CSV table of C-alpha atoms and ligand atoms in Angstrom, one decimal:
chain,number,residue,atom,x,y,z
A,34,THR,CA,14.1,76.4,-88.3
A,35,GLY,CA,13.3,75.8,-84.3
A,36,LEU,CA,10.8,74.2,-82.2
A,37,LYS,CA,7.5,76.2,-83.0
A,38,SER,CA,7.9,75.6,-86.8
A,39,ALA,CA,8.7,71.9,-86.3
A,40,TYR,CA,5.8,72.1,-84.6
A,41,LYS,CA,3.3,74.3,-86.0
A,42,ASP,CA,0.7,71.9,-87.2
A,43,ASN,CA,1.0,69.9,-83.5
A,44,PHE,CA,0.5,72.5,-80.7
A,45,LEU,CA,2.6,76.0,-79.4
A,46,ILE,CA,6.0,75.4,-78.1
A,47,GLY,CA,5.9,78.0,-75.1
A,48,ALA,CA,8.7,78.8,-72.4
A,49,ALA,CA,7.9,80.3,-69.1
A,50,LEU,CA,10.1,83.6,-69.0
A,51,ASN,CA,11.6,85.3,-65.7
A,52,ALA,CA,11.5,89.0,-65.2
A,53,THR,CA,14.9,89.4,-66.9
A,54,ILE,CA,14.0,87.7,-70.0
A,55,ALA,CA,10.9,89.4,-70.4
A,56,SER,CA,12.8,92.8,-69.9
A,57,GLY,CA,13.9,92.5,-73.4
A,58,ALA,CA,18.0,93.3,-72.4
A,59,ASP,CA,19.4,89.5,-73.4
A,60,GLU,CA,19.3,89.8,-77.1
A,61,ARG,CA,20.8,86.5,-77.3
A,62,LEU,CA,17.6,85.2,-75.7
A,63,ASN,CA,15.1,87.3,-77.8
A,64,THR,CA,17.1,85.8,-81.0
A,65,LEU,CA,16.2,82.2,-79.2
A,66,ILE,CA,12.6,82.8,-78.1
A,67,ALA,CA,11.9,84.5,-81.2
A,68,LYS,CA,12.9,81.2,-83.1
A,69,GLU,CA,11.9,78.5,-80.6
A,70,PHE,CA,8.6,79.4,-79.2
A,71,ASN,CA,5.5,81.0,-80.3
A,72,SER,CA,3.7,80.7,-76.4
A,73,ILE,CA,5.4,82.5,-73.2
A,74,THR,CA,3.9,82.1,-69.7
A,75,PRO,CA,5.2,85.1,-66.9
A,76,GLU,CA,7.0,82.7,-64.6
A,77,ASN,CA,6.3,84.9,-61.4
A,78,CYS,CA,5.3,88.4,-62.3
A,79,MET,CA,1.5,88.1,-62.7
A,80,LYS,CA,1.2,86.2,-59.1
A,81,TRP,CA,-0.7,88.1,-56.5
A,82,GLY,CA,1.9,88.4,-54.2
A,83,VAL,CA,4.5,89.4,-56.4
A,84,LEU,CA,2.7,91.4,-58.5
A,85,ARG,CA,0.8,93.4,-55.0
A,86,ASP,CA,2.6,94.4,-51.5
A,87,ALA,CA,0.9,93.1,-48.3
A,88,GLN,CA,-1.1,95.9,-48.8
A,89,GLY,CA,-2.9,95.2,-51.9
A,90,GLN,CA,-1.1,97.9,-53.5
A,91,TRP,CA,-0.1,97.3,-57.4
A,92,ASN,CA,3.4,97.3,-59.7
A,93,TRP,CA,3.0,96.7,-63.2
A,94,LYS,CA,6.3,97.1,-64.1
A,95,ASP,CA,7.2,93.4,-65.0
A,96,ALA,CA,3.8,92.6,-65.6
A,97,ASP,CA,3.9,95.2,-68.1
A,98,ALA,CA,7.3,94.3,-69.5
A,99,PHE,CA,6.3,90.7,-70.3
A,100,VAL,CA,2.9,91.5,-72.1
A,101,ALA,CA,5.2,94.3,-74.3
A,102,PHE,CA,7.7,91.4,-74.9
A,103,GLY,CA,4.8,88.8,-76.2
A,104,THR,CA,3.3,92.1,-78.1
A,105,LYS,CA,6.6,92.8,-79.5
A,106,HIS,CA,7.8,89.0,-81.1
A,107,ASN,CA,3.7,88.3,-81.0
A,108,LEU,CA,3.8,85.4,-79.1
A,109,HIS,CA,0.8,83.8,-77.9
A,110,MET,CA,0.3,84.7,-74.2
A,111,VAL,CA,-0.9,82.6,-71.0
A,112,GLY,CA,-1.7,84.5,-67.6
A,113,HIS,CA,-0.2,82.6,-64.5
A,114,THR,CA,-2.2,82.6,-62.4
A,115,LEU,CA,-5.1,84.4,-60.7
A,116,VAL,CA,-6.0,82.7,-57.9
A,117,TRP,CA,-3.4,80.1,-56.3
A,118,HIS,CA,-2.5,79.5,-52.4
A,119,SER,CA,1.4,80.3,-52.9
A,120,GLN,CA,2.9,83.8,-53.9
A,121,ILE,CA,-0.1,85.5,-52.1
A,122,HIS,CA,0.4,87.2,-49.1
A,123,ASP,CA,-1.3,86.0,-45.6
A,124,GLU,CA,-2.8,89.5,-45.1
A,125,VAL,CA,-5.1,88.3,-48.1
A,126,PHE,CA,-7.1,85.8,-45.9
A,127,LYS,CA,-6.0,86.7,-42.2
A,128,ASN,CA,-6.1,89.8,-39.8
A,129,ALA,CA,-2.8,90.8,-38.0
A,130,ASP,CA,-3.9,88.2,-35.0
A,131,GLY,CA,-4.4,85.3,-37.4
A,132,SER,CA,-7.8,85.1,-37.7
A,133,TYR,CA,-9.7,84.7,-41.0
A,134,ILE,CA,-11.8,86.9,-43.1
A,135,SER,CA,-15.2,86.4,-43.4
A,136,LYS,CA,-15.9,84.7,-47.1
A,137,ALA,CA,-18.1,88.2,-48.5
A,138,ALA,CA,-14.6,89.9,-48.0
A,139,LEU,CA,-12.3,87.8,-49.2
A,140,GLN,CA,-15.1,87.4,-52.0
A,141,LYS,CA,-14.4,91.2,-52.5
A,142,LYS,CA,-10.8,91.0,-52.7
A,143,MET,CA,-11.0,88.3,-55.3
A,144,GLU,CA,-13.4,90.3,-57.0
A,145,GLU,CA,-11.0,93.5,-57.3
A,146,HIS,CA,-8.1,90.8,-58.2
A,147,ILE,CA,-9.6,89.6,-61.1
A,148,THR,CA,-11.2,92.6,-62.3
A,149,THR,CA,-7.9,94.7,-62.5
A,150,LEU,CA,-5.6,91.7,-63.2
A,151,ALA,CA,-7.7,89.9,-66.3
A,152,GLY,CA,-9.1,93.5,-66.9
A,153,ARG,CA,-6.0,95.3,-67.6
A,154,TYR,CA,-4.6,92.3,-70.5
A,155,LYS,CA,-8.4,91.8,-71.5
A,156,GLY,CA,-7.6,90.6,-75.0
A,157,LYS,CA,-4.0,90.7,-74.6
A,158,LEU,CA,-3.3,87.4,-73.1
A,159,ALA,CA,-4.8,84.5,-74.8
A,160,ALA,CA,-5.2,82.2,-71.9
A,161,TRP,CA,-5.4,82.1,-68.1
A,162,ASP,CA,-4.5,79.8,-65.5
A,163,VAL,CA,-7.5,80.7,-63.7
A,164,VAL,CA,-7.2,78.3,-60.6
A,165,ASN,CA,-3.8,76.9,-59.8
A,166,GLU,CA,-3.2,73.7,-57.4
A,167,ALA,CA,-6.3,72.8,-55.8
A,168,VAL,CA,-6.6,69.1,-54.9
A,169,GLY,CA,-4.1,68.5,-51.9
A,170,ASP,CA,-1.3,65.4,-52.5
A,171,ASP,CA,-3.5,63.4,-50.0
A,172,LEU,CA,-6.0,63.8,-53.0
A,173,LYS,CA,-8.6,65.6,-51.0
A,174,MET,CA,-9.1,69.7,-51.9
A,175,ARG,CA,-5.9,71.4,-50.8
A,176,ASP,CA,-6.6,72.9,-47.2
A,177,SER,CA,-5.9,76.0,-48.6
A,178,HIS,CA,-7.3,79.6,-46.9
A,179,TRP,CA,-8.6,80.0,-50.2
A,180,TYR,CA,-10.2,76.5,-49.4
A,181,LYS,CA,-10.9,77.0,-46.0
A,182,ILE,CA,-12.6,80.3,-46.0
A,183,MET,CA,-14.4,79.7,-49.4
A,184,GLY,CA,-14.9,75.7,-50.4
A,185,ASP,CA,-15.4,75.0,-54.1
A,186,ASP,CA,-16.6,78.2,-54.7
A,187,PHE,CA,-12.9,79.6,-54.5
A,188,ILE,CA,-12.4,77.9,-57.9
A,189,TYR,CA,-16.0,78.3,-59.4
A,190,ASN,CA,-16.1,81.9,-58.7
A,191,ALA,CA,-12.9,82.8,-60.2
A,192,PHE,CA,-13.6,81.1,-63.0
A,193,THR,CA,-17.0,82.7,-63.4
A,194,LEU,CA,-14.9,86.3,-62.7
A,195,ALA,CA,-12.5,85.8,-65.1
A,196,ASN,CA,-14.9,85.0,-68.0
A,197,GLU,CA,-16.9,88.2,-67.3
A,198,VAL,CA,-13.8,89.7,-67.7
A,199,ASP,CA,-12.4,89.0,-70.9
A,200,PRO,CA,-15.3,86.7,-72.4
A,201,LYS,CA,-12.7,85.7,-75.3
A,202,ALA,CA,-9.9,84.3,-72.8
A,203,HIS,CA,-9.1,80.3,-72.9
A,204,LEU,CA,-9.2,79.5,-69.4
A,205,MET,CA,-7.5,76.7,-67.5
A,206,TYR,CA,-6.9,74.9,-64.7
A,207,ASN,CA,-3.4,74.0,-63.9
A,208,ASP,CA,-2.0,71.3,-61.4
A,209,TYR,CA,1.2,69.0,-61.0
A,210,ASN,CA,1.5,65.6,-60.1
A,211,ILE,CA,-2.2,65.1,-62.2
A,212,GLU,CA,0.0,62.6,-64.6
A,213,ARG,CA,-0.5,59.8,-61.4
A,214,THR,CA,-3.1,58.0,-60.6
A,215,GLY,CA,-5.0,59.0,-58.0
A,216,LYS,CA,-4.7,62.7,-58.3
A,217,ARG,CA,-5.6,62.6,-61.7
A,218,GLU,CA,-8.8,61.4,-60.8
A,219,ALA,CA,-9.3,63.6,-57.8
A,220,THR,CA,-9.0,66.2,-60.3
A,221,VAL,CA,-11.5,65.1,-63.1
A,222,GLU,CA,-14.1,64.4,-60.5
A,223,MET,CA,-13.4,68.2,-59.4
A,224,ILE,CA,-14.1,69.4,-62.7
A,225,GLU,CA,-16.8,67.5,-63.3
A,226,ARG,CA,-18.7,68.3,-60.3
A,227,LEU,CA,-17.7,72.1,-60.9
A,228,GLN,CA,-19.0,71.9,-64.6
A,229,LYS,CA,-22.3,70.5,-63.8
A,230,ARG,CA,-22.4,73.6,-61.7
A,231,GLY,CA,-22.0,75.4,-65.1
A,232,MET,CA,-18.5,77.0,-64.3
A,233,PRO,CA,-17.3,78.6,-67.7
A,234,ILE,CA,-13.7,76.6,-68.4
A,235,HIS,CA,-11.7,75.9,-71.4
A,236,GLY,CA,-8.4,74.2,-70.7
A,237,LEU,CA,-6.8,71.8,-68.8
A,238,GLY,CA,-3.1,72.5,-67.9
A,239,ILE,CA,-0.8,69.6,-66.9
A,240,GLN,CA,2.1,70.9,-65.1
A,241,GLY,CA,4.5,68.3,-66.5
A,242,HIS,CA,7.2,68.7,-63.5
A,243,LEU,CA,8.5,64.9,-64.4
A,244,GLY,CA,11.6,63.2,-63.3
A,245,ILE,CA,14.3,61.4,-65.3
A,246,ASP,CA,12.3,58.2,-65.1
A,247,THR,CA,9.1,58.7,-63.6
A,248,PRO,CA,6.0,58.9,-64.1
A,249,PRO,CA,5.8,56.7,-67.5
A,250,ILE,CA,4.6,57.7,-70.5
A,251,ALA,CA,1.4,55.1,-69.7
A,252,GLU,CA,0.6,57.7,-67.2
A,253,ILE,CA,1.0,60.7,-68.8
A,254,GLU,CA,-1.3,59.2,-71.6
A,255,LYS,CA,-4.2,58.3,-69.5
A,256,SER,CA,-4.3,61.8,-67.9
A,257,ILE,CA,-4.4,63.4,-71.5
A,258,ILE,CA,-7.0,61.4,-72.4
A,259,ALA,CA,-9.4,61.6,-69.3
A,260,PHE,CA,-9.3,65.1,-69.4
A,261,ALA,CA,-10.0,65.9,-72.9
A,262,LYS,CA,-13.0,63.8,-72.3
A,263,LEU,CA,-14.3,66.2,-70.2
A,264,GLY,CA,-14.5,68.4,-73.3
A,265,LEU,CA,-11.7,70.7,-72.5
A,266,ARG,CA,-8.3,71.5,-74.4
A,267,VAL,CA,-5.0,70.1,-73.1
A,268,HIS,CA,-2.0,72.0,-72.6
A,269,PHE,CA,1.4,70.9,-70.9
A,270,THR,CA,2.4,74.2,-68.7
A,271,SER,CA,5.3,73.8,-67.0
A,272,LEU,CA,7.5,71.1,-68.9
A,273,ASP,CA,10.8,70.2,-67.4
A,274,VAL,CA,13.0,67.0,-66.6
A,275,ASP,CA,14.8,66.5,-63.1
A,276,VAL,CA,17.8,64.7,-63.8
A,277,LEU,CA,18.7,64.9,-59.8
A,278,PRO,CA,18.9,62.2,-56.9
A,279,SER,CA,15.0,62.4,-55.8
A,280,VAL,CA,14.1,63.3,-52.4
A,281,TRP,CA,10.6,62.5,-53.2
A,282,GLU,CA,10.6,58.6,-52.0
A,283,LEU,CA,12.7,58.8,-48.9
A,284,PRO,CA,12.7,56.7,-45.7
A,285,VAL,CA,10.5,57.9,-43.0
A,286,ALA,CA,13.8,59.1,-40.8
A,287,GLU,CA,14.4,61.8,-43.2
A,288,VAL,CA,11.2,63.9,-44.4
A,289,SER,CA,14.1,66.7,-44.1
A,290,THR,CA,16.9,65.8,-44.0
A,291,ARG,CA,15.5,65.2,-47.3
A,292,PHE,CA,15.8,69.0,-48.4
A,293,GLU,CA,19.4,70.2,-46.8
A,294,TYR,CA,21.8,70.2,-49.4
A,295,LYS,CA,23.8,67.2,-49.4
A,296,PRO,CA,26.8,66.3,-51.8
A,297,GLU,CA,25.4,63.4,-53.2
A,298,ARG,CA,22.3,64.6,-54.1
A,299,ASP,CA,24.2,67.0,-56.2
A,300,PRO,CA,26.2,64.9,-58.3
A,301,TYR,CA,26.4,67.0,-61.7
A,302,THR,CA,27.7,70.0,-60.4
A,303,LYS,CA,31.0,69.6,-62.8
A,304,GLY,CA,28.8,69.2,-66.1
A,305,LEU,CA,25.8,66.4,-66.8
A,306,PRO,CA,28.1,63.3,-68.3
A,307,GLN,CA,27.2,62.3,-71.6
A,308,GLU,CA,25.3,58.9,-70.6
A,309,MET,CA,22.6,61.2,-68.7
A,310,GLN,CA,22.7,63.8,-72.0
A,311,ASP,CA,21.2,60.9,-73.7
A,312,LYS,CA,18.7,59.5,-70.9
A,313,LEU,CA,17.5,63.1,-71.0
A,314,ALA,CA,16.9,63.2,-74.8
A,315,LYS,CA,15.3,59.6,-74.9
A,316,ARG,CA,13.3,60.7,-71.9
A,317,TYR,CA,12.1,63.9,-73.8
A,318,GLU,CA,12.0,62.2,-76.9
A,319,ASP,CA,9.2,59.6,-75.4
A,320,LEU,CA,7.4,62.6,-74.2
A,321,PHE,CA,6.8,64.2,-77.3
A,322,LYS,CA,6.3,60.8,-79.2
A,323,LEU,CA,3.4,60.8,-76.7
A,324,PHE,CA,2.3,64.7,-77.2
A,325,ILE,CA,2.7,63.9,-81.0
A,326,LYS,CA,0.3,61.1,-80.6
A,327,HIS,CA,-2.4,63.1,-78.9
A,328,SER,CA,-1.9,66.7,-80.3
A,329,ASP,CA,-5.8,66.8,-81.3
A,330,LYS,CA,-6.0,67.1,-77.7
A,331,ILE,CA,-3.2,69.0,-76.7
A,332,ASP,CA,-3.2,73.1,-77.5
A,333,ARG,CA,0.5,73.7,-76.4
A,334,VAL,CA,3.6,72.1,-74.7
A,335,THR,CA,5.1,75.2,-72.3
A,336,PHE,CA,8.8,74.6,-70.8
A,337,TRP,CA,9.3,76.0,-67.2
A,338,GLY,CA,12.1,77.9,-68.6
A,339,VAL,CA,14.3,78.4,-71.3
A,340,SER,CA,17.9,77.3,-70.4
A,341,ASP,CA,19.3,75.1,-67.6
A,342,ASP,CA,21.0,78.2,-66.0
A,343,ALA,CA,17.7,79.4,-65.3
A,344,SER,CA,16.0,76.3,-64.1
A,345,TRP,CA,13.8,76.3,-60.8
A,346,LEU,CA,14.6,72.8,-60.2
A,347,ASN,CA,18.4,74.6,-59.5
A,348,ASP,CA,17.1,75.2,-56.3
A,349,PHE,CA,13.4,73.4,-56.0
A,350,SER,CA,13.5,71.0,-54.5
A,351,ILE,CA,17.0,71.7,-53.0
A,352,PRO,CA,18.2,74.8,-53.1
A,353,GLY,CA,21.6,75.7,-55.1
A,354,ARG,CA,21.6,72.1,-57.1
A,355,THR,CA,23.3,72.1,-60.4
A,356,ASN,CA,20.4,70.5,-62.5
A,357,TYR,CA,19.9,69.7,-66.4
A,358,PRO,CA,15.8,69.8,-67.2
A,359,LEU,CA,15.3,72.0,-70.3
A,360,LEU,CA,16.3,71.7,-73.7
A,361,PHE,CA,19.3,74.5,-74.0
A,362,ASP,CA,22.3,74.8,-71.9
A,363,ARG,CA,24.0,77.2,-69.2
A,364,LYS,CA,25.6,78.6,-72.6
A,365,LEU,CA,22.1,79.0,-74.3
A,366,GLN,CA,23.3,75.5,-76.8
A,367,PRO,CA,20.6,73.2,-77.5
A,368,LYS,CA,21.3,69.9,-76.2
A,369,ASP,CA,20.9,66.3,-77.2
A,370,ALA,CA,17.3,66.6,-76.4
A,371,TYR,CA,16.5,69.1,-78.4
A,372,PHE,CA,18.0,67.7,-81.9
A,373,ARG,CA,15.8,64.6,-81.1
A,374,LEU,CA,13.4,66.6,-81.3
A,375,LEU,CA,13.4,68.4,-84.3
A,376,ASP,CA,14.1,64.6,-86.0
A,377,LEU,CA,10.9,63.7,-84.6
A,378,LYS,CA,9.1,66.4,-86.7
A,379,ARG,CA,11.7,66.5,-89.4
A,380,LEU,CA,11.5,62.7,-90.3
A,381,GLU,CA,8.2,62.4,-89.9
A,382,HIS,CA,5.6,59.7,-92.3
A,383,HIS,CA,2.9,60.9,-93.8
B,401,LIG,O1,15.7,79.4,-58.8
B,401,LIG,C1,14.9,80.3,-57.6
B,401,LIG,C2,13.8,80.9,-58.4
B,401,LIG,O2,12.9,79.8,-58.7
B,401,LIG,C3,12.1,80.6,-59.7
B,401,LIG,O3,10.7,81.0,-59.4
B,401,LIG,C4,10.1,80.1,-59.0
B,401,LIG,C5,9.3,79.3,-59.9
B,401,LIG,O4,9.6,79.0,-61.2
B,401,LIG,C6,8.2,78.6,-59.5
B,401,LIG,O5,7.1,78.1,-60.4
B,401,LIG,C7,6.0,77.4,-60.6
B,401,LIG,C8,6.3,75.8,-60.5
B,401,LIG,O6,5.5,75.2,-60.5
B,401,LIG,C9,4.0,75.0,-61.0
B,401,LIG,O7,4.3,75.2,-61.9
B,401,LIG,C10,3.6,76.7,-60.7
B,401,LIG,O8,2.4,76.6,-61.4
B,401,LIG,C11,4.6,77.6,-60.8
B,401,LIG,O9,4.4,79.1,-60.3
B,401,LIG,O10,7.2,79.5,-58.5
B,401,LIG,C12,8.5,79.7,-57.2
B,401,LIG,C13,9.6,80.4,-57.9
B,401,LIG,O11,10.4,80.5,-56.6
B,401,LIG,C14,13.0,81.4,-60.2
B,401,LIG,O12,13.7,80.5,-61.6
B,401,LIG,C15,13.5,81.9,-59.1
B,401,LIG,O13,13.2,82.9,-58.2
B,402,CL,CL1,10.9,86.2,-62.4
B,403,CL,CL1,29.7,62.3,-64.0
B,404,MG,MG1,-1.8,91.4,-78.9
């Protein structure tokens, strides 16, 4: 059968779904999703600034279509995300003159947003990313407007609110590069200090935006262990593997430059050679060996897309590259990495 049944006894197999896919209108992705995944996450549609215009006004079409889809196919559904510094309008934070509104006023906007959003899907969504990406890459609390107006209380109040709205909801914190030493620890710290405040939190999302070579598997492992120790369920939430030239490690004189589209940084436009098909299978296989090792700690592994043609890495971090990060190709056909992963479970020894 599919991924989901292969991994039934391990964890949920999930896909982020764009709004075209959430519409139901692609029978070929319906057939695929129904076979392969049992968990879905809205890739964009339940984000503050996508869901609401700059005046706080709500359009629920896509948000509603996504919940109709998972109800329809009976898939576990993750809300993404109540409180985040990205894809949210500056009018949330700032007067037209640039100045920041009071904390009190922003609290009120947060109350309303969580109350309406979690409230509306209370009991339909099993899980929420309540706060997304609150630790800076300099390993300090990210200097978002959330943070600058509110402090730790934006995260605190966000969870407490969420939990009051849907008591039943599994409530996560979600971040990227927390596979990595340094930011892993600053996040463990962050949870700890809020958990001693009594903040209701149930899960820790590891985004899992990985590269073909890095981070190493020992890294990821340390993080699975650190976070579960905080008495939380571990999720891999935005899984994909970047197979393109990295701009992450570039010399000074090229901080951008580095985001500009350049030929050589897009080397596989004519197709992914077999030699890299293979590095990608092997890298997915290492990851999933790891995940199986620790499936007492991991509740779910979600991919940040269904197929390559629809991966966000085609445009991040350089617009318009041809990447190959996911299990299904641009023709919806499964890739070498896919069979390696069925095989792990198929041939498993007990
Ligand atoms: O390719 C163009 C564009 O990218 C995609 O939407 C993007 C989302 O996938 C992206 O998701 C975040 C990835 O980082 C973290 O996991 C974070 O938690 C996610 O929200 O968000 C930015 C979007 O531009 C679409 O495929 C398409 O619109
Ligand atoms: Cl979308
Ligand atoms: Cl090639
Ligand atoms: Mg339901």
